Design goal:
4 copies of one chain form a homotetramer. Chain A has about 110 residues and is mainly beta. The first copy, chain A, has one domain. Helices cover about 10% and strands about 55% of the residues of chain A. Chain A has a 5-stranded mixed β-barrel with strand order 1-3-4-6-5. The longest helix of chain A has 10 residues. At the A-C interface, strand 1 of A face strand 1 of C. Strand 1 of chain A pairs antiparallel with strand 1 of chain B, so a sheet runs across the interface. The complex binds 5-fluorouracil (URF) (2 copies). The site of one 5-fluorouracil has 4 residues of chain C, from loops. One 5-fluorouracil binds next to loops of chain D. Chains C, D: Pfam families: SSB (PF00436). Chains C, D: This is Single-stranded DNA-binding protein. Chains C, D: Keywords: DNA-binding. Chains C, D: GO terms for molecular function: single-stranded DNA binding. Chains C, D: One of its GO terms (cellular component) is nucleoid.
Chain lengths: ~110, ~110, ~100, ~100
């Protein structure tokens, strides 16, 4: 069934890259996306989307993407449930990126 | 900034419609979206997206949408943080629908 | 760069199916997409989008999709030339009717 | 019915700005959208999409957007006629450069 997400935002931290003994690399980062419908002084808010990326895309994210860089994301919305180390159920909604595009560096509105 | 979600899935329960004394109606429902990339016998999984709808769209959802109906959704991805009644922080990612389209009823693959 | 199109409409005619000299199936159809909001006059307009789909999905388009069938399409917007033509290249198609 | 297009590309020429006899500003520009994946030969192709934007957004397109400027576009796919023309009608435009 149809499931498509497109985002443009800025990374809040530098991307992390973990791995499982199953041998696959899993990159994660948070995308801060300012709301367009409230972009005006006195009411600018952002949403913070969790993006997850795997395999090849995941390493090109760790190399070339840094905290504060503008990135575009294209993917699916997916949900998980796990148990944290305390025994509480955790429900997650993340964007699984099919492609991540590097748009602008960290400080492009003062450097340009 | 760009933020677009498009979904087609089936409702897991009947939509709920709450209200605040601020006088605005807030409709909510969960959309179950089968993954396209695993649609085959032996590996069909779905993701369960929380959709939120307001004002007029929200009532036309409660009238005309029921558990098991196929619905299409178009909107933004948004995040909230609140405190539940126990004092734990709760982080939510939901789809805020701009439009909700009614596609097929509950039992359309046996009635058609 | 990002390029994504998502559509839901009905086919105007029956899906067509050709092949490439490389042996790849090329399914085509036109989708009538009603506008969700009416226009200044109140009438409902539809747009007529040309969709293209490849390989085995194109065969399932030919088998299970007919004139008037409701379909969802997910893909890219691409431009071709001779007369400039724009079509949606579907990587995914969803069959909303049996 | 659902109809959504999202694009990121660069303008091929300078944005144009006309008006309707009803007094609404109509901004137009062409966006060159590079394909993310290369083709069977390995070359990178771009698509050239016609974008249309209205009212005050069209004015901010004329002020702040120039040939070669990077822009994001969010809107509908619509079809017009005389020669069949398909354009993206932008409800939102994002300026990726100052
Ligand atoms: O009714 C139609 N209008 C336009 C078309 F391209 C088509 O196939 N059918
Ligand atoms: O280089 C270009 N190709 C096609 C176009 F429509 C255009 O404006 N520019």
């Amino acid at each position: 069934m149809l499931n498509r997400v497109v985002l443009v935002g800025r990374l809040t931290k530098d991307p992390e890259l973990r791995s499982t003994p199953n041998g696959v690399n899993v990159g994660t980062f948070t995308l801060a996306v300012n709301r367009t419908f409230t972009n005006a002084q006195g009411e600018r808010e952002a949403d913070f989307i969790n993006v997850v990326v795997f395999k090849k895309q995941a390493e090109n994210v760790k190399n070339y993407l840094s905290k504060g860089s503008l990135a575009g994301v294209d993917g699916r919305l997916q949900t998980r449930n796990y148990e944290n180390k305390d025994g509480q159920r955790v429900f997650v909604t993340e964007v699984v990126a099919d492609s991540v595009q590097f748009l602008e560096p960290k400080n492009n509105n003062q450097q340009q």
